[model samples]
Target: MKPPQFTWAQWFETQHINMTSQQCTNAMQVINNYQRRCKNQNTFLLTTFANVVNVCGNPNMTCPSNKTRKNCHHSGSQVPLIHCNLTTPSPQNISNCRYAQTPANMFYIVACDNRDQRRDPPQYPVVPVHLDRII
Candidate 1:
């Protein structure tokens, strides 16, 4: 049988991973902006959304982070057999969350995987109809 849960580092392993529900992708717009700046500037930080998140793996953020950032550096991620939680409007477990942040570089900042849920998934649940109206 498998263990009760997974450790933080274990969650990232390609063979086995948690947070599977969360799909990570490259931040396109931010990456483009950083590229434009690369044409002139040598060193830069992909400009924060509101100066809230300056890094991706920062474990200091707490709630209200945008979709561009996914704080995977929480304490929960560091534990063994554990699945890290997001610092969103309604945090499942952890209260704090690290917002999104692109890396800086000579050419531009390095892009990382990101994902966010702006709205809840659409539900197609149908309410039970009453037969009393039919004669």
Candidate 2:
């Protein structure tokens, strides 16, 4: 489905950064495309994009992936974030999909997408395409 504008960086920003606990409900509306149903959970990092992406190349920061994909990378140390989990007994309206926010510090996982040198960002040859998990 096509929207006005959507990019990998935009998706990451919407899903993983620049929001607080109080904004999760409203944020999810956009993420869910104004749908009634809500996402089960999401963790928003309270860190800079450059800091998060910096974990990609360091060998010491690597960890065993939780899934089959080998492209996942883990933060070398814990980082602060707001963890949101949807309330049970599903709501019928997008406005009612309130999420409980839990502030935590933990190592995070992200899936990296490879890019051609021509298309890559100046400082990041490989960029994070998805937030895999928070552990």
Global lDDT scores for all candidate models: 0.23, 0.67
Candidate number achieving the greatest TM-score relative to the actual structure: 2
Candidate 1's C-alpha runs over 4 A off are 1-5, 14-68, 72-135
Instruction: Please provide, for model 2 over 37-65, each residue's C-alpha lDDT reduced to its tens digit, 9 standing for 90 to 100.
Output: 57788788988878867866645233345
Per-candidate TM equals 0.13, 0.73
Model 2 has an lDDT value of: 0.67
- The residue-level lDDT of candidate 1 at 128 comes to 12
Q: What TM-score would you give candidate 1 relative to the actual structure?
A: 0.13
Q: Looking at model 1, which ten-residue stretch has the lowest summed lDDT?
A: 126-135
TM-score of 2: 0.73
**Model 2 lowest lDDT segment of ten:** 58-67
